Amino acid sequence: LDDITRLNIIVGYVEEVEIHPDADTLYCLKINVGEEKSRDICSGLRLKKNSEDLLHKYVLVLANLKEKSLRGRKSHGMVLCGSFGEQIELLAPPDGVNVGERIICENMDVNKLPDKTLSFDKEKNPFFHIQPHLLVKNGVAHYKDAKWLSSKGEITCPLEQGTIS
Prior knowledge:
Layout (H helix, E strand, L loop, with lengths): L8 E11 L7 E6 L6 E5 L14 E5 L5 E3 L2 E3 L5 E4 L2 E4 L13 E2 L20 H5 L3 E4 L2 E4 L2 E5 L2 E2 L7 E3 L1
Antiparallel strand pairs: 1-2, 1-4, 2-3, 5-6, 7-8, 7-14, 9-12, 10-11, 10-14, 11-12, 12-13
PDB class: rna binding protein
Keywords: aimp1, emapii-like domain, plasmodium, RNA binding protein
Assembly: monomeric
């Protein structure tokens, strides 16, 4: 359960930001994560972020959550962020990353595949057990003491300290 190899965290390009008709606080995002079709992912950043803040960014998607249907709108995956006090910012890959690349920690075995699919029950979903150990420390993202890595270097967050959701 507390095993980060089980998460499939991948970089996507946010193609489109739209507001959710029936959800006051959700943007409806279209995010290319290397698949044949770009995915539809909801995000609860409507009250703390403007559209151009998200549009055309490279983001980190937890890809292996199961598709859900919120308020008429499908949402498959979620976009990862740093949070401190009242601020929330996106986690960012340095530029040059490819849609679809798996973001891994230091000393992690790339052959340790992530779960095909994570549970619907929060309590049986590695992510929420792992989450308390997911932090930004000095503007970098960490699992525990091990930094998150992309093909072009460590994952950054504009916040100095913070927690990952």
